[model samples]
Target: ESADLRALAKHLYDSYIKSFPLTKAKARAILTGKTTDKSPFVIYDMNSLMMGEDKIKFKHITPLQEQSKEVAIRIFQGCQFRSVEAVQEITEYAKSIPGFVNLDLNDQVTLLKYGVHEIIYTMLASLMNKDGVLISEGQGFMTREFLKSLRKPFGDFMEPKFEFAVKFNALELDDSDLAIFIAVIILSGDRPGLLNVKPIEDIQDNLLQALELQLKLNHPESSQLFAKLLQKMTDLRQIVTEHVQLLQVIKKTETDMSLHPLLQEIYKDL
Candidate 1:
């Protein structure tokens, strides 16, 4: 019976209590405010020629091509900085999964390398609407239009995620559901080079059971939620693949942009 599933679900939820990072209500509030030069949006610029220890006044530099390229890189840096935290949260969450630590160390890294992007994208739903995403814990809002104004490949990377976050938000999941969903994604059996496949598969099976039951209980009227979520997982794969292709294009054309080392390591293989 799902009595066992219920306990598993609770454990997953507890592990993911750190899921929101930014509550949806706060995200909505930050997004509602108009961003202007007076109350400038915070832009996290982690580059070679940067000042400020962390947060600072948002500055816009000129020269059409230079400005566009820098804006895109600035946005990437902002997202990447947040991604470091996402990785930390995911690692903490993953460690709570039974048998996770026992898996090959390389396999653990592989899972995080592939899964963290999706996890970050999923978490972004709380901070996004159809128009834009709230960043740096309400310090800035990155509009879709602003992102689209940047250089081609660099400008294009975040669109799919914006769309995905919008659709994903419509699913109306709370933190508990998200916790299990992220856990299942990370523990997926299909990651390449996994040494202990069957054990991971078994863990995933239990998690899927927890997720299916949790969704059923919560979204009783929407019988298709689980199926839609599974489809969203496939959609995530395609989005990330496109992201990888776009990143490759940026690497070839924009020689000046440097990926953060941690982000570089994650993107190195895939």
Candidate 2:
């Protein structure tokens, strides 16, 4: 039975990941966190000159536009929305794994809470068409220039994430890589209050072993996929660390802001 389940894991991994890079060209149109319009949130100042041929600078060089605050709040809410949606998607994927449900429910929730934003950025790293990512569920794209136009707090919140995603994209990861890698983040025993670390780490190890085998099978010519994927996790966590710190700052600055209840619950004891 155990052996049969492992077979299914391999089969499912194929469904979720094996088609990546092959499907990458098509994936741009289909991936999560995508938007068709992708109109930038910050409209630039064309009247101002000296920034060179481009009509505008990425950062706001002119008097700050009133729309930026509104857009930033909207993006903030949208991020919470996307993060919530990602958890739901990842939950199905996690539950599909044979032993994942055996862990303590709180620990499972803890992993999700502590890491959802990081997880979103990780998957989005694959969808990154260029230097920036699709945010607001594909309605808008945030590039470095776009981040600069946002208010300082919002820009600070996003710039590091983009840098991290850019580095992650340097690894040229695909969907298959993300499926296993995301599982590593989800089953992580290092989160602050994990209850069943033994079972959690066991599941993590199994995923690690499976990922290694998959890399060898899929990336026969390449040597570093496995290690790079592991290191990317650490890099992502570092970015996420900065993310939550700014989140704390945002919350303190704007007590009137609306945050999703699930997100509120997740951040409660943190």
**Number of the top-ranking candidate, with lDDT as the measure:** 1
Q: Candidate 1: misplaced stretches above 4 Å?
A: 23-69
lDDT of 1 by residue, 98-213 (tens): 77898889889988888988888887887887777665566565667666666677668778888898889899887778888888899988887777788889888998899999
Error of 1 at 87 (Å): 1.5
lDDT of 2 by residue, 1-270 (tens): 446435645665664543222233334664443546334332233222123225322322222442344656755654566666666766666666567777778877888777676677777665465445544334334455665567758767766766776777776666666667777777788989778789888878887776777666667677988888888778877776776788889888974467779877876775
Query: In order, how many clashes per candidate?
Result: 0, 4
Clashing pairs in model 1, backbone N/Cα/C closer than 3 A: none
Candidate 1 achieves a global lDDT of: 0.75
- lDDT of all predictions: 0.75, 0.63
